[PDB]
Ligand binder design. Structure first.
Ligand SMILES: *[C@@H](CS(C)(=O)=O)[C@H](Cc1ccc(CN)cc1)NC(=O)[C@H](CC(C)C)NC(=O)[C@H](CC(C)C)NC(=O)c1cnccn1
Ligand SMILES: [Cl-]
Ligand SMILES: [Mg+2]
Ligand SMILES: [Mg+2]
Lengths: 204, 250, 241, 231, 243, 226, 240, 244
């Protein structure tokens, strides 16, 4: 009945030293029934990464929408969009549906190509921006993720330490939520290389 | 009480000319000389405040206009057409850009939007083309400084330096001799004032010349403090005093 | 030669319909003049009641647009009233939306932008009128702003409009060349009106009775027109010195 | 000449040529006569045939139980205007339980025809109408021209050669106005009037069309052997 | 040339020739007048009796607006009716919102702006009527006259149509000989006279007089037609003056 | 949320906390509740966070364009009128509760705007879940002709009252001072009374602690070119 | 909207815009339709002013409207696309509501109706296109060949040509086509179609295109070499 | 009324031609020449700028060659402003197709859409047609490399090599003379520049006058790369082919 928790799933993003990480689980369900264990929630438009939790149809729809918009942006501007600008685009686009919203919890992650500055942001379903320094959480186990992130996190982690922290935050949160899990993916993002890792986790 | 002009007033003649655009360019030719020069660390745009009467307060008539904090515009031709284009240019910067991306548009894209508006006057029903050529100078983070010309047709070209209107043929020859790629902003202002003296008959001073620059960020002109990222407008209109200072070193 | 019938460009780059709207401006054969004091803006205009059957109280080319703004027109009355009603509506709508009284210059710009649209759009003709707006603006002080059929507008220290505008203009030009200031250095509006009338008498070379003039005065927070008796008191003072 | 391309253009002498040309279509139309007394009002119409095989074009149209008209000019335009009258008569009945006044019916036709003369794209109506009716102020006869001018008359005629009938009625004025409580004699006077506009042809049984309305008489049309009595 | 073929086109003079051509239609029409009196107005009109077949007193030309305004016009009669119909809509929507009946100067502009609007576009024709109208409001009596251009002024006396020069001369005498003013019943009589005198320009056909009046004392400020004995008294007065 | 605004000798001052909450949890510990509208006109927003942000940004864009058109400094009454007329239109469905303050050629001004479009004029005002805690402090201490130094103290105190005593409010104190004839000064993180205490343990993991199934490089660049 | 009456009657009772549209058809490359006993063949001219063309991707002159009906044309190419699109839409719409594909006569009637609508609508000019529409009705083995034109008239033809020098190829077909015994086989029908084009085309085989349509949605376009064999056989028989 | 002033843009002449299309084509014949040449391993687009001034900022300038998506580009001949209206529409049609089907738009579908938009202006609306001819260069996985042209009539056709704008008669003769089917991109580059060099109304062909672009399936690992040549890169290729 509650759209944000039909399909389930989570996204978490963290900043580190000269890097960002964004991660997600792989579950798509119809409430109790597990349906797919390959539903990725993290997309990218050039070097800007967007995780989306919530109602799966809107997750897919918004991905297709932001691909569309960023493609036109690039043809007109003659450069890839940056995370700060994209964040504003995400907010704009969600708030224009203020009274018929997309039931999602988006999370922007990326490194500004000109300043080199790590950047993460989160939004509620109608586009209010939470531009955190430390971490952003989203999904059905957001409470669990807040609890993990808030204790596990420390600032200025190196890429390969940040991987461990964000992974353990995701995994232990997802195991305390019925509607998350079934696999997990972790992107480690640096200014000009991005590593993607699939995690081993309990499949219940 | 109907708008029955749903057909183009601009059409192709047998020779392939679009008459109304050509005539709009003729109106631009009769208009007062304006110019633009691009330096390494800035752009300058300039024109003569041709006062219709000495009783008129020419300060109130702004031929040089701020479009965004980092973009400025000047014209030659029909002033009323320019005024409304400035109004639409300012608005389109917000509606089609700032309210989407949370930042002001880059020079080329705002120019593109103005160009579009002028093109539509050249094809839409029941309208004549705009009788102006615009020179738009601006700066943005990824393209740097730039200067664009926009014609009644909706065509736009980027320039290192140019002139439009009355004495544009003579002025462009003058700019070709003086311009190089190592100019500082002060040097361009100096060249702008020299070039503009040739096309001016009567008085030549800070009160009869309008001149603005796209240069460094002006945090003093911002009006507020407390946000490190917002450093202030690059557009600045030179004062009557500031022009007369540079005319002594001329 | 249909380039002379609608608002499109001639081969010369000219809009003949705009130029002919300007000629309609002088169809009334009335001369107007506006000047600025320290605390006020005075506008005077010739009043000609040729018919004895006319009710002279209804013959006016001066309009009270808002409390603060007055508008004198040079041109045929139907277009004058068209422009007056629109200006009133615009001045009320402005106050409602933005919470303060519409400034004189902003109204002038708005009416000019409207006039511009008639020069670009073919189905609308230009109005054959020159609108001279006057107020004591709360920010700018005494203000004269004039709009024409071309959509051009500009501020003025003083101005004159009509068939003999050049004579009135040069008379005013010469006075401000002497005084070397942008206004009439005078405390009371009563004396600024006396100045306005005097310098029109000198320029036109004609004497006036109370019924040959029409006067409008802008002060802080109100614009008002003078009655025939108020003007008479003005004319008496001029004659007595 | 130059000023007759559309209805929106005045000539230099203040004339609307398109209206005057629409007026000309009435003159080409077949004659019809209207006349009344204090008790009854009568229409008489000379219907026109295309040739000997064809029917005779119907000239009279009923608008309500107490009102109707005869036409001269473009018959499709008379259909439009009559249909409008029917609706107005009907609107008055349904909403106000009130029979529409004949004078007010004229005013409505006038204003409908006027809109076509002042606006671009439209054309004037190319038809003249003679409206008869009996309302709360007795018998009435109206003449509608497509310029917009509607005129309350004792009698009149419109169409080709109508001037003959109109001069007759102008002489007979004092006689026929007094024909009260006698429908047949009032019809006779109308049939005699329309006879003044005939040349070569005469009034046959399928040629003639008569209608009448009055005090205790609904608007009824007579054609065929019902008008043989009056030939 | 070609500047007179389209409405809303300025000639090189600065004239709208189509509007001036509408004036020729007005000049071609029958004579109508208005007389402002002490506490009201009086309207009168010449109705040409084209034929004996016209019903007397039936083809009424003067029209009321609201309850307190009278309108008469010369020229294309249907155009005049279209304008009055508009006036009625204006007067109704004014009263609907503001409760009070529309003041006469306010009403005058509502027509003036509407007529003017028909000189702004080539898709419409100017009005082929000069309209004389007025009545009594809270500020007293008012008489107006409105031309095809949308130009209107207040008047002491007004006249338009074929006999306007004749009428105007007669109105100018009344203004000179009665500076303190004219009573309502006086104005009715003078109106009758002026229409009779102005009938020398339309002398071929005989005519029918029609008069109306608003007066604060005589009609309670309401528009009423002059009927019966008062109409006959005015006709007699007029007939005596021509002889 | 806890927002407040008050007037002093030759100016107006706004205050706000920095805690944004979803349900019972703390989504943001450092959010800006003081919104830019014009260089010398600001707005404190409580209620629905997206609605309050979006409404101020819109009016701020329209105020800028209006300023450009009229060649004048924008007025607080213009912002006030535009905000209320927009909020009224939406019948409280834009759940933004605002305190608008500023300086313009007319003088200094302070107004509150509720979600349904009602507006108040006051010398001190407070809105949001901590308004009662803040108003208690303002009512106890506010007086006429405050100095700027007293005004900042009182504003920050009113916000603090909310921070401590109200669960909805928390974290830091943002202040904006708009004084006549001077640039407005925006003071984000004016107070920082809620820095987290150091943790007992570092939960940084030994590398390889997490079990990994696959690895791959993501191509983020345009075209790898020949 | 733009409402101007472009197609109107002239004093002599002609609608010049419709007749001038036929002149655009007269300019267009020659198209010919010949129906046999168990097939229809659509021949089309390709003007050889344009070499360096890419014949894989260039719009082919014969278009499928459904799997069983085809449409060729002469006149303005851009105009033809609009008709072809509308027809293809109507073909699927008919299947969706009637549960049966269109007849060739129905499809022709629809296209003809669209062409007609443009000759008495405000703001539009007629289509500068005449069409040949050919195929077989569902579960029917009788060949169909219809012709439409800008005015909106349509009619059935044993054989017909349209476009430039269609006068000459109609002359040829009128003497060579026998109604009592039409081209019995596919070969004979194709040969008569190629022969008829060879009167006007004046060049070998690149300038001729052939499409054969047979019953039960059996449509195939002939290649250059297949057509070139017909051209060879025709002129070898002619040398005698 | 208004009828008086209506040019009637969408009518046939007695001969069955569309006046405005024909006159727009006459307009386009004065525009700077654009040449497209298709090879087995790529497409070349070469075009001559029209406004030689020394003061024109060439590196940020774009009058001739525009990108429609990552696979498809266009060369323009005619009114630049008109072309930019159409280009922004074509860019949107591409992205709509991508959003709907999750596949890049085939070249012919995009071309047909634009050409249909141009057609609309000749048949209805009473507006002037777009004074633009395009050369479309593109790639998709169905037909591979494709060249098309469209003109103001909305007619489009496919090509192996083609010219639009000025001196197309002279240009098409020269292309027809030297083109071959087994040709390669590097050869086509040379042909394009040689053709412009002979047909140009200018005294000599220089780098500051040209816009140049290639679409190659000679990117890393069998992808397709669009290269819009920078001014220095045009100057290099002019020296390489031996024109300057
Ligand atoms: C405090 C308002 S209160 C509880 O009435 O005193 C605060 C005001 C605020 C916060 C952040 C900004 C930044 N632009 C401006 C103003 N509002 C919130 O904390 C709201 C409180 C909700 C409306 C009860 N929180 C939200 O709007 C959050 C998004 C935030 C975290 C960005 N969204 C929701 O709570 C929510 C709940 N259900 C559906 C959608 N959103
Ligand atoms: Cl405006
Ligand atoms: Mg689980
Ligand atoms: Mg015009």
């Amino acid at each position: 009945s509650d759209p944000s928790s039909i399909n389930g799933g989570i996204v978490v993003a963290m900043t580190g030293k000269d890097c960002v990480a964004i991660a997600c689980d792989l579950r798509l369900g119809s409430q109790s029934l597990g349906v797919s264990n390959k539903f990725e929630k993290i997309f990218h438009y050039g070097h800007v990464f967007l995780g989306i939790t919530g109602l799966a149809t809107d997750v897919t729809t918004l991905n297709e929408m932001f691909r569309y918009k960023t493609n036109l942006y690039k043809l007109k501007e003659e450069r890839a969009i940056e995370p700060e600008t994209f964040t504003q685009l995400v907010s704009s686009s969600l708030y224009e549906r203020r009274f018929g919203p997309y039931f999602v919890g988006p999370v922007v992650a990326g490194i500004n190509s000109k300043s080199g500055k790590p950047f993460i942001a989160g939004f509620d379903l109608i586009g209010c921006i939470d531009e955190a320094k430390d971490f952003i959480v989203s999904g059905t186990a957001s409470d669990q993720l807040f609890g993990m992130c808030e204790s596990l996190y420390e600032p200025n982690l190196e890429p390969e330490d940040l991987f461990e922290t964000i992974s353990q935050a995701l995994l232990n949160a997802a195991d305390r939520d019925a509607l998350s899990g079934w696999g997990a993916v972790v992107y480690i993002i640096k200014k000009d290389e991005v590593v993607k890792r699939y995690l081993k986790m309990r499949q219940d | 009480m109907t708008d029955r002009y749903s057909f183009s007033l601009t059409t192709f003649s047998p020779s392939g000319k679009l008459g109304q655009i050509d005539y709009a360019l003729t109106a631009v030719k009769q208009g007062v000389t304006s110019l633009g020069i691009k330096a390494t660390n800035g752009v300058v745009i300039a024109t003569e405040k041709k006062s219709s009467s000495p009783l008129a307060m020419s300060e109130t008539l702004s031929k040089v206009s701020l479009l965004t904090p980092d973009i400025g515009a000047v014209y030659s031709g029909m002033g009323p057409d320019y005024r409304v284009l400035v109004d639409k240019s300012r608005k389109v910067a917000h509606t089609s850009y700032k309210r989407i991306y949370g930042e002001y548009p880059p020079t080329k894209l705002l120019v593109s939007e103005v160009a579009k508006i002028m093109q539509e006057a050249t094809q839409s029903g029941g309208v004549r083309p705009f009788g102006v050529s615009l020179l738009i100078a601006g700066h943005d983070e990824f393209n740097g400084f730039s200067l664009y010309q926009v014609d009644p047709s909706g065509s736009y070209f980027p320039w290192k330096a140019t002139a439009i209107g009355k004495g544009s043929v003579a002025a462009k020859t003058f700019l070709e001799k003086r311009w190089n790629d190592e100019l500082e902003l002060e040097d361009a202002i100096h060249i702008a004032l020299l070039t503009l003296k040739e096309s001016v008959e009567g008085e030549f001073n800070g009160d009869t010349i309008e001149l603005a620059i796209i240069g460094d960020e002006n945090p003093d002109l911002l009006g507020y403090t407390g946000i490190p990222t917002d450093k202030g407008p690059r557009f600045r209109k030179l004062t009557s005093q500031e022009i007369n200072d540079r005319l002594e070193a001329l | 030669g249909y380039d002379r019938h609608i608002t499109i460009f001639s081969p010369e780059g000219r809009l003949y319909q705009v130029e002919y709207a300007f000629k309609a401006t002088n169809q009334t054969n009335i001369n107007s003049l506006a000047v600025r004091g320290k605390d006020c803006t005075v506008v005077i205009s010739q009043k000609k009641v040729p018919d004895k059957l006319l009710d002279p109280t209804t013959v006016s080319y001066i309009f009270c647009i808002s409390r603060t703004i007055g508008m004198v027109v040079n041109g045929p009355i139907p277009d004058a009233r068209n422009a007056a009603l629109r200006a009133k509506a615009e001045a009320a709508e402005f106050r409602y939306k933005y919470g303060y009284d519409m400034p004189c210059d902003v109204l002038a710009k708005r009416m000019a932008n409207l006039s511009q649209i008639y020069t670009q759009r073919a189905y609308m003709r230009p109005l054959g009128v020159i609108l001279t707006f006057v107020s004591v603006d709360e920010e700018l002080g005494p203000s004269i702003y004039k709009t024409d059929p071309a959509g051009y507008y500009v501020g003025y220290k003083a101005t004159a409009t009509g068939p003999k505008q050049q004579e009135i203009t040069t008379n005013l030009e010469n006075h401000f060349k002497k005084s070397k200031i942008d206004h009439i250095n005078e405390e009371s509006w009563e004396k600024v009106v006396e100045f306005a009338i005097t310098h029109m008498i000198d320029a036109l070379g004609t004497e006036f009775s109370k019924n040959d003039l029409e006067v409008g005065v802008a002060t802080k927070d109100k614009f008002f027109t003078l009655s025939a008796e108020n003007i008479e008191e003005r004319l008496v003072a001029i004659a007595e010195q | 000449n130059n000023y007759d391309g559309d209805t929106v253009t005045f000539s230099p002498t203040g004339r609307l040529f398109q209206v005057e040309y629409a007026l000309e279509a009435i003159k080409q139309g077949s004659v019809t006569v209207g006349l009344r007394s204090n008790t009854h009002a009568v229409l008489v119409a000379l219907k026109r045939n295309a040739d000997e095989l064809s029917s005779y074009q119907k000239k009279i149209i009923k608008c309500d139980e107490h009102m109707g008209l005869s036409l001269a000019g473009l018959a499709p335009d008379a259909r439009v205007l009559s249909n409008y009258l029917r609706q107005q008569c009907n609107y008055s009945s349904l909403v106000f339980n009130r029979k529409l006044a004949v004078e007010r019916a004229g005013h409505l036709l006038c204003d409908k025809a006027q809109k076509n003369t002042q606006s671009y794209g439209g054309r004037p109506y190319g038809v003249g109408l003679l409206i008869i009716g009996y309302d709360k102020s007795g018998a009435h006869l109206l003449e509608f021209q497509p310029s917009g001018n509607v005129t309350e008359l004792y009698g009149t005629a419109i169409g080709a050669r109508s001037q003959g009938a109109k001069t007759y009625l102008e002489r007979t004025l004092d006689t026929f106005i007094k024909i009260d409580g006698n429908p047949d004699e009032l019809i006779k006077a109308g049939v005699e009037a329309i006879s003044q506009s005939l040349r070569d042809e005469s009034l046959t049984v399928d040629n003639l069309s008569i209608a009448i309305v009055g005090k205790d008489t609904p608007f009824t049309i007579y054609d065929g052997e019902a008008v043989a009595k009056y030939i | 040339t070609g500047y007179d073929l389209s409405n809303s086109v300025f000639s090189p003079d600065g004239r709208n020739f189509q509007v001036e051509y509408a004036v020729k239609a007005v000049e071609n029409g029958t004579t109508s007048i208005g007389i402002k009196c002490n506490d009201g107005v009086v309207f009168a009109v010449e109705k040409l009796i084209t034929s004996k077949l016209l019903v007397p007193q039936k083809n009424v030309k003067i029209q009321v607006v609201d309850r307190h305004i009278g309108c008469v016009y010369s020229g294309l009669i249907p155009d005049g009716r279209h304008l009055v119909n508009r006036g009625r809509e204006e007067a109704a929507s004014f009263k609907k919102l503001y409760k009070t009946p529309i003041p006469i100067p306010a009403f005058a502009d509502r027509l003036g702006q509407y007529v003017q609007a028909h000189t702004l576009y080539n898709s419409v024709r100017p009005f082929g009527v000069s309209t004389i109208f007025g009545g009594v409001d809270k500020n007293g009596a008012h008489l107006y006259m409105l031309e095809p251009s949308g130009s209107y002024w207040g008047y002491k006396g007004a006249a338009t149509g074929k006999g306007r020069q004749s009428a105007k001369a007669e109105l100018e005498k009344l203004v000179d000989h009665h500076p303190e003013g004219l009573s309502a019943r006086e104005a009715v009589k003078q109106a009758a006279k002026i229409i009779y005198l102005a009938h020398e320009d339309n002398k071929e056909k005989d005519f029918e007089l029609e008069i109306s009046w608003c007066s604060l004392s005589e009609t309670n400020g309401l528009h009423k037609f002059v009927k019966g004995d008062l109409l006959q008294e005015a006709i007699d007065f007029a007939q005596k003056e021509i002889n | 949320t806890t927002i407040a605004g008050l007037v002093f000798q030759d100016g107006v001052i706004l205050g706000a906390d920095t805690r944004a909450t979803n349900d019972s949890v703390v989504a943001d510990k450092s959010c800006e509740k003081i919104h830019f509208i014009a260089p010398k006109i600001y707005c404190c927003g409580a209620g629905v966070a997206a609605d309050a942000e979006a409404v101020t940004q819109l009016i701020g864009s329209n105020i800028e364009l209006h300023s450009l058109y009229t060649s004048r400094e924008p007025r607080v009454v213009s912002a006030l009128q535009m905000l209320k007329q927009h909020l009224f239109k939406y019948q409280g469905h834009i759940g933004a509760y605002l305190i608008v303050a500023g300086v313009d050629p007319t003088g200094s001004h302070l107004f509150s705007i509720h979600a349904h479009g009602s507006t108040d004029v006051g010398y001190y005002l407070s809105l949001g879940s901590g308004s009662l805690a803040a108003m208690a402090v303002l009512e106890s201490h506010w007086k006429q002709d405050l100095t700027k130094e007293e005004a900042i103290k009182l504003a920050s105190d009113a916000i603090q009252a909310g921070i401590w005593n109200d669960l909805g409010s928390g974290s830091n104190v943002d202040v904006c001072v708009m004084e006549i004839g001077k640039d407005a000064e925006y003071l984000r993180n004016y107070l920082t009374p809620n820095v987290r205490e150091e943790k007992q343990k570092s939960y940084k993991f030994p590398r390889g602690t997490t079990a990994v199934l696959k690895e791959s490089i993501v191509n983020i660049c345009d075209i790898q070119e020949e | 909207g733009y409402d101007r009456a472009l197609s109107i009657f002239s004093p002599d009772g002609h609608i010049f815009q419709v007749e001038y549209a036929l002149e655009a058809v007269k300019r267009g490359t020659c198209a010919v339709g010949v129906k046999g006993k168990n097939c229809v063949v659509l021949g089309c001219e390709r003007r050889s002013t344009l070499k360096l063309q890419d014949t894989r991707i260039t719009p082919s002159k014969v278009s499928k409207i459904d799997s069983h009906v085809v449409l060729s044309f002469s006149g303005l190419n851009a105009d033809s696309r609009i008709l072809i699109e509308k027809a293809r839409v109507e073909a699927q719409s008919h299947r969706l509501t009637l549960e049966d594909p269109v007849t060739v006569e129905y499809l022709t009637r629809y296209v003809a109706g669209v062409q007609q609508r443009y000759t008495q609508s405000g703001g539009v000019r007629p289509f500068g296109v005449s069409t040949l529409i050919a195929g077989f009705d569902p579960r029917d083995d009788e060949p169909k060949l219809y012709q439409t034109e800008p005015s909106g008239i349509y009619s059935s033809w044993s054989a017909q040509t349209i476009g430039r020098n269609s006068k000459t190829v109609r002359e040829f077909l009128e003497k060579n086509y026998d109604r009592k015994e039409p081209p019995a086989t596919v070969e004979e029908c194709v040969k008569l179609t190629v022969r008829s084009l060879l009167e006007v085309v004046q060049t070998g085989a690149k300038n001729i295109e052939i499409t054969v349509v047979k019953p039960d949605s059996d449509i195939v376009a002939l290649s250059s070499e297949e057509i070139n064999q017909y051209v060879t056989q025709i002129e070898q028989e002619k040398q005698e | 009324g208004s009828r008086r002033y209506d040019s009637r843009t969408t009518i046939f002449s007695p001969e069955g031609r569309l006046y405005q299309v024909e006159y727009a084509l006459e307009s386009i014949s004065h525009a700077g020449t654009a040449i497209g040449i298709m090879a087995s391993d790529g497409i070349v687009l070469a075009a001559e700028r029209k406004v030689t001034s020394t003061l024109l900022e060439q590196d940020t300038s774009t009058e001739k060659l525009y990108k429609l998506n990552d696979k498809i580009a266009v060369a323009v001949a005619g009114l630049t402003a008109d072309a930019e209206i159409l280009i922004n529409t074509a860019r949107i049609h591409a992205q709509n197709y991508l959003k709907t089907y999750n596949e890049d738009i085939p070249v012919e579908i995009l071309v047909r859409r634009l050409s249909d938009i141009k057609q609309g202006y000749t048949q209805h609306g009473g507006l002037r047609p777009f004074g633009v001819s395009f050369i479309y260069a593109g790639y998709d996985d169905r037909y591979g490399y494709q060249l098309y042209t469209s003109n103001p009539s909305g007619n489009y056709t496919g090509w192996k090599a083609i010219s639009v704008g000025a001196n197309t008669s002279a240009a098409q003769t020269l292309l027809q003379m030297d083109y071959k089917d087994d040709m390669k991109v590097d050869d086509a580059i040379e042909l394009a520049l040689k053709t412009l060099s002979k047909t140009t109304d200018s005294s000599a062909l220089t780098y500051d006058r040209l816009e140049f672009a290639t679409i190659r399936k000679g990117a890393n690992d069998g992808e397709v790369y669009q290269k819009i040549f920078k001014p220095q890169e045009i100057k290099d290729i002019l020296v390489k082919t031996g024109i300057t």
